[PDB]
Structure formats: structure tokens, C-alpha cells
Amino acid sequence: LLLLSSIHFQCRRLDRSAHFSTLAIKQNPLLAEAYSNLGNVYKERGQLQEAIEHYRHALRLKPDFIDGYINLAAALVAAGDMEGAVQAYVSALQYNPDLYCVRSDLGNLLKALGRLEEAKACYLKAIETQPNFAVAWSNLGCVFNAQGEIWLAIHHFEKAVTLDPNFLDAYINLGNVLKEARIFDRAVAAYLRALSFSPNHAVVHGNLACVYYEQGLIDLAIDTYRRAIELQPHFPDAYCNLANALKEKGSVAEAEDCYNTALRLCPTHADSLNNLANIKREQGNIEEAVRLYRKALEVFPEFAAAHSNLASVLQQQGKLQEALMHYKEAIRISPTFADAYSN
């Protein structure tokens, strides 16, 4: 009568599973597992408060019921009771501290709540329990990464993929940290391994294209940016990034087309406004350059480059005092501009 509740649940025949669990409580209001089997039905229906109450009842009857604490934590996370779920996981680990998957889920919750040092401890203990548990190595990487510790982030992602060579998310995390560290040939390798498992991943294509650009492989960047657009076409940053690579190559006409595409999508795209103004400036259409830098500054008043570039075009027009104001505000915002000017 509880095995039949639990059998129907494995088949997701939830009406029949709830019927069989409700009968086991008409025939014994003290069996812990039947209130849990009922909670599991409510859980799959998205009736979370009902699931929680049934879980809590099962636990008031059998406080050593590990699965009650696990299922309860799930339901409290889904319902936004974050620290309740922390406590449910903590009790489960009191009763079986060898539950390394639980301990990693507990770590993930601790991470989400900004308690990076406790999360770290969870992951480390999970690893001490089960040293080959690649997820925990990867999660710990992500803690190190959020703490600015790039080397330790890399270390833990590489351990993650050595343990599990099919671990897509660990390759992506590894590529992203290598990209931040400017270790570009290793980043490329990690992105290309990710693409081996997920060939159409739009965000990885975007990051890989950026790594190629940082390397000075402009043609390869451009090809990768084009594919990134195909994969995710109606957002302006991907067009502005393509255009920046086109401009670097000297394909000015197509760069201008791409900037204009981004600006139909997003008329206040400040990078596109500035970078298109730069094409205008370089071609000698000073009036249109001025117009666009000024639009960029309306979107982003503290855009140092746009101030600098504006100042340059005003200086050419002989508007020397207005130029000077913008030179000075570029330096106020980003002082290294003064070292660029002097050079």
C-alpha cells in the first residue's frame, strides 16, 4: 500500500500514487514515508506549501528520514525559503555525512546567498568524502573565481575535466576564467572542447570570437562572430562586436552596416554610437561624428572615450574651449587618458 504509492510515483501516475499514499494514512496516520510520497506528488504539481507541510509532518514523525529532508529542501528552494532549506540540508548531513551530493547542493545554496567561505567548506568536505566527484571540483572553481582567485579557479576546473572529460559546463567555466586571465590559447582549447559537446552554443561562440580578436586573429574572429549572430540574431552587442572586428580588418563599409544594424535594434547602444562616430571621424565627416558622440554621451554621460573623441573633432572644428572641457572630463573619468594624450 506504500510500495504501490511509490511504484505509481516512479511511473508519474500521480493521481494513483496519491490515492495509494492517502489509503496508507487512512490505515495508519503514523507511517512517515506516506506523507513524504504525498509531498512528492504535490511537489511535481507545483503545490509547494502543501508539499512542505507534508514533508514537515513526515519529519515530525521520523526525524532520521534523510529523503524527507532532501525533498523538503528542494521544495523550500523552489518556494524561495532559502535558509530553511539550508537547515534541512544541515539535518540531513547530521544523519548521513557521506551524502556528498547533498553537501554539494548545500554548497550551491550557500554560494547563492553570498556565504562563499561556508560554500567552500561544503565543497571541500564533499571532495574529502568522494575525491572523484567532478561537480564539486567545478563548483569550488566557481567560488574561487568569484573571490578573484584565478589560479585556484583554473586548478579546480581542470581537475573537474580530468575527472569527467565530458563535463561541458566545467569546460565553459575553464574557458571563461582563462579568457579573464588572458591565457588565450588555453581558452580557445577549452571553448573548442565545449563546442564539441554543444556545437551551437551561442554564448561560447561569442566568447571564442573575442578570444580570437584578443589574439589578433581578426579573420577567424570575424568568422566566429558571424556564426554567433546566426545563432542568436536579434541582439545588438553581437553586431557591434562583429563590426569592431570588421573595422580592425579595414572592411569599413560592412562595419558601418553592422553598427547600423545594432542601432536599429537598440537606438541607445552607446558602443555602436561611438564606434560608428569613429568611422565618420576617420573618413572626415566631422559633423556626423560630432552628432554621434553627442548621442553616445546622452546615453552614457560618463563615457570617457566618447568625451575624448568628441574633444578631438571639436578641436578640428576650432571649437577649442568646448574641446578642452571634453579633454578634461575624459581625464577626470579615466586618468590614463592624460598618458595616452602625452604619448
Author numbering: 58 to 400
Q: What does the report in the manuscript say about this coordinate set?
A:
The ID-associated mutation L254F (Vaidyanathan et al., 2017) is located on TPR helix 7, distant from the active site. To investigate structural changes attributable to the L254F mutation, we determined the crystal structure of the mutant TPR domain (TPRL254F). Diffraction data were collected to 1.75 Å and initial refinement starting from the TPRWT structure required substantial rebuilding of the terminal TPRs, an early indication of considerable conformational changes. In wild-type OGT, L254 occupies the interface between the helices of TPR7, with its side chain constricted in a pocket formed by the surrounding residues N223, L225, Y228, and R250. Mutation of L254 to the bulkier Phe appears to be accommodated in this pocket, however, by causing small changes in torsion angles of the residues lining the pocket and by displacing TPR helix 7B away from helix 7A by 1.5 Å. Increasing shifts of the TPRs starting from the mutation site lead to a maximum shift of 12 Å for the N-terminal TPR. The melting curve for TPRL254F was shifted, yielding a Tm of 55°C, indicative of reduced thermal stability. In sTPRL254F conformation 1 (sTPRL254F-C1), the F254 side chain occupies the same position as observed in the TPRL254F crystal structure, while in sTPRL254F conformation 2 (sTPRL254F-C2), the F254 phenyl moiety interacts with the side chains of N223, L225, and Y228 and the backbone of the F224 and R250. Thus, the L254F mutation destabilizes the interface between TPRs 6 and 7. The data presented here show that the L254F mutation causes a subtle structural distortion at the mutation site that propagates through the TPR superhelix, resulting in a substantial displacement of the N-terminal TPRs and a markedly increased structural plasticity compared with the TPRWT.
O-linked β-N-acetyl-D-glucosamine (O-GlcNAc) transferase (OGT) and hydrolase (OGA) control a dynamic, reversible, and tightly regulated post-translational modification termed O-GlcNAcylation. OGT possesses 13.5 tetratricopeptide repeats (TPRs) at the N terminus, which harbor all currently known ID-associated mutations (Lubas et al., 1997). In OGT, the TPRs form a 120-Å superhelix, which serves as a potential interaction surface for substrates and binding partners (Jínek et al., 2004, Zeytuni and Zarivach, 2012). Recently, mutations in the N terminus of human OGT have been associated with ID, namely, A319T, L254F, R284P, and Δ155-177 (Bouazzi et al., 2015, Niranjan et al., 2015, Willems et al., 2017).
